[PDB]
Design an enzyme around this catalytic site. Structure first.
Site, short mmCIF file in Angstrom:
data_model
loop_
_atom_site.label_atom_id
_atom_site.label_comp_id
_atom_site.label_asym_id
_atom_site.label_seq_id
_atom_site.Cartn_x
_atom_site.Cartn_y
_atom_site.Cartn_z
N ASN A 192 0.85 -1.23 0.10
CA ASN A 192 0.24 -0.16 0.06
C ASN A 192 0.83 1.19 0.02
O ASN A 192 1.65 1.44 0.70
CB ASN A 192 -0.96 -0.09 1.21
CG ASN A 192 -2.06 -1.21 1.26
OD1 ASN A 192 -2.00 -1.89 0.39
ND2 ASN A 192 -2.52 -1.25 2.24
N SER A 208 0.26 9.12 0.15
CA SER A 208 0.65 10.32 -0.69
C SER A 208 1.86 10.97 -0.16
O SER A 208 2.35 11.12 0.94
CB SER A 208 -0.50 11.49 -0.23
OG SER A 208 0.07 12.77 -0.67
#
Ligand SMILES: Cc1cc2nc3c(=O)[nH]c(=O)nc-3n(C[C@H](O)[C@H](O)[C@H](O)COP(=O)(O)O)c2cc1C
Ligand SMILES: O=C(Nc1c(F)c(F)c(-c2ccccc2)c(F)c1F)c1c(O)nn2ccccc12
Ligand SMILES: O=C(O)c1cc(=O)[nH]c(=O)[nH]1
Ligand SMILES: [Cl-]
Ligand SMILES: [Cl-]
EC number: 1.3.5.2
Length: 357
Positions: free
Chosen positions: A182, A185
Site C-alpha cells: 500500500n 501520498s
C-alpha cells in the site's frame, strides 16, 4: 435473483448485524468461511469471465479484497464462495494488536463501513506457516485459475518501511501469486527507493516462487501524486496497481450516525471515486499496467463500470458484509449478462473500453 440472495439480504444478514457489532460479525464470518459453512455457490463460471493477467489465469474476475482474511485463515472457504482470486492481509512483520476497540463501524443507510483496525496482524511467521500448510493445494488452485494474493503491511513502530516490506517479500513472496504494497501520498524519490527495494527482493526469489508486485493506492491522492506514482510504476516495471483502498474523505450526503468516526470509508460512497481513480491511472499508464479495481462493487454494473474504466480484475469487501456470501454469484451472473448485452465477447474485450469511445 436466487432464493439464497434474497434470504441472506432480507433476513439472515440484517438479523446477524442487529445481534453482532461489526468486528464480532467479521470474526464469525471468518470462522464460518474457514469451516466451509456456506450457502451453495450455484453459479458456474463461463469462459467469458476468464482473464489472463499478472502471469496467471483467473477463472473469474471477482476477488475478495484485502482485510477480510487478514491472517490467511479462510482462503479455501473464500474460493468455495465463488471468488476468482483471494487476497489475504495486510500482514505485518511482527504480530501486532491494532487500534483500540471499537474500531469498525457500519453506516447501513449509506451501504458503507468505516474502519480503523490499524493493521491488526498475526504477523509474517504465523501466516507463513498457515500458507505452507496448504501450499500444494494452492499450487493446484492457481493452476486451475484461482490465484492467491498477499498484501504486505508494516509495523506501527517501524523506522524503515522499506525493510518491513522487504521482510514480507522474503517470507510470503514464495507463497503468493502476487504481492501488494500500500502506498500513501508523497516524496517521489522515496517511493522509487521503497519500490526498488521491494522489486530487488522479489527478483531474488526462485522463478517458480517469484510473485508479481502490485502497488495499492488510496483514492485520496492529489493529481501530482497520481502522476508521480504512474511515472515510478512505469520506470521500475511494477506489475500492476490496486485502485483503491478506503477513503479518509467524507463525501457530502453520508447519513449514517457514525459518519464522523476516524478511519477509512468503504462501500457505495467510495464507488465512483474509485472508478474515476481507475480511469485516471489507466490513462496515466497508457493501459499497459494491469489494474485491480476495488471500491463499492455490489453488482454486475458496478463491476463492468470498473472494467470499462480500465480494470482487468475487480475486488469487493463491503458488499459481502451486507449481502453475505451469495453476493459473489450475484455479481458474476450480472456481469456476464451485461457483457452479453453490450456485445462483448468476454471480460477481456471490455477492459478499458470507455477509453476507446
Ligand atoms: C474492515 C476493513 C478492513 C480492511 N483492511 C485492509 C487491509 O488490511 N489492507 C488493505 O490493503 N485494504 C484493507 N481494506 C480495504 C479493502 O481492501 C478495499 O480496498 C476497500 O474496502 C474498498 O472495497 P469495498 O468498498 O468493496 O469494501 C479494508 C477494508 C475494510 C472494510
Ligand atoms: O463480516 C461481516 N458480516 C458477515 C457475517 F456476519 C456473516 F455471518 C457472514 C457469513 C459468512 C459465511 C456464511 C454465512 C454468513 C458474512 F459473510 C459476513 F460478511 C461484517 C459485518 O456485518 N460488518 N462488517 C464490517 C467490517 C468487516 C466485516 C463485517
Ligand atoms: O487495518 C486497517 O485499518 C486498514 C488497512 C487498510 O489498508 N485499509 C483499511 O481500510 N483499513
Ligand atoms: Cl537458485
Ligand atoms: Cl457529523
Amino acid at each position: 435473483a436466487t432464493g439464497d440472495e434474497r434470504f441472506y439480504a432480507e433476513h439472515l444478514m440484517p438479523t446477524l448485524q442487529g445481534l453482532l457489532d461489526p468486528e464480532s460479525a467479521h470474526r464469525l464470518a471468518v470462522r464460518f468461511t474457514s469451516l466451509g459453512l456456506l450457502p451453495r455457490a450455484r453459479f458456474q463460471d463461463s469462459d467469458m469471465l476468464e482473464v489472463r493477467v499478472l502471469g496467471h489465469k483467473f477463472r473469474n474476475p471477482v476477488g475478495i479484497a484485502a482485510g477480510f482474511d487478514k491472517h490467511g485463515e479462510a482462503v479455501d472457504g473464500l474460493y468455495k464462495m465463488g471468488f476468482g482470486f483471494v487476497e489475504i492481509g495486510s500482514v505485518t512483520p511482527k504480530p501486532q494488536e491494532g487500534n483500540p476497540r471499537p474500531r469498525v463501524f457500519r453506516l447501513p443507510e449509506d451501504q458503507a463501513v468505516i474502519n480503523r483496525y490499524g493493521f491488526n496482524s498475526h504477523g509474517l511467521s504465523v501466516v507463513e506457516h498457515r500458507l505452507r500448510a496448504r501450499q500444494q493445494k494452492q499450487a493446484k488452485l492457481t493452476e486451475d485459475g484461482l490465484p492467491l494474493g498477499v498484501n504486505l503491511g508494516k509495523n506501527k513502530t517501524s523506522v524503515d518501511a522499506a525493510e518491513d516490506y522487504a521482510e514480507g517479500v522474503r517470507v510470503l513472496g514464495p507463497l503468493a501469486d502476487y504481492l501488494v504494497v500500500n502506498v500513501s501520498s508523497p516524496g517521489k524519490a522515496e517511493l522509487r527507493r521503497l519500490l526498488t527495494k521491494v522489486l530487488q527482493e522479489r527478483d531474488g526469489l526462485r522463478r517458480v516462487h517469484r510473485p508479481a508486485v502490485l502497488v495499492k493506492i488510496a483514492p485520496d491522492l492529489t493529481s501530482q501524486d497520481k502522476e508521480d506514482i504512474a511515472s515510478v510504476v512505469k520506470e521500475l516495471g511494477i506489475d500492476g496497481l490496486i485502485v483503491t483502498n478506503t477513503t479518509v474523505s467524507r463525501p457530502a450526503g453520508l447519513q449514517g450516525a457514525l459518519r464522523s468516526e476516524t478511519g477509512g470509508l468503504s462501500g457505495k460512497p467510495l464507488r465512483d471515486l474509485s472508478t474515476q481513480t481507475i480511469r485516471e491511472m489507466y490513462a496515466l499508464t497508457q493501459g499497459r499496467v494491469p489494474i485491480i479495481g476495488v471500491g463499492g462493487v455490489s453488482s454486475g454494473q458496478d463491476a463492468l463500470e470498473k472494467i470499462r474504466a480500465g480494470a482487468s480484475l475487480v475486488q469487493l469487501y463491503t458488499a459481502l458484509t451486507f449481502w453475505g456470501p451469495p453476493v459473489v454469484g450475484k455479481v458474476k451472473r450480472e456481469l456476464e449478462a451485461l457483457l452479453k448485452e453490450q456485445g462483448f465477447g468476454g471480460v477481456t474485450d471490455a477492459i478499458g473500453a470507455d477509453h476507446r469511445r
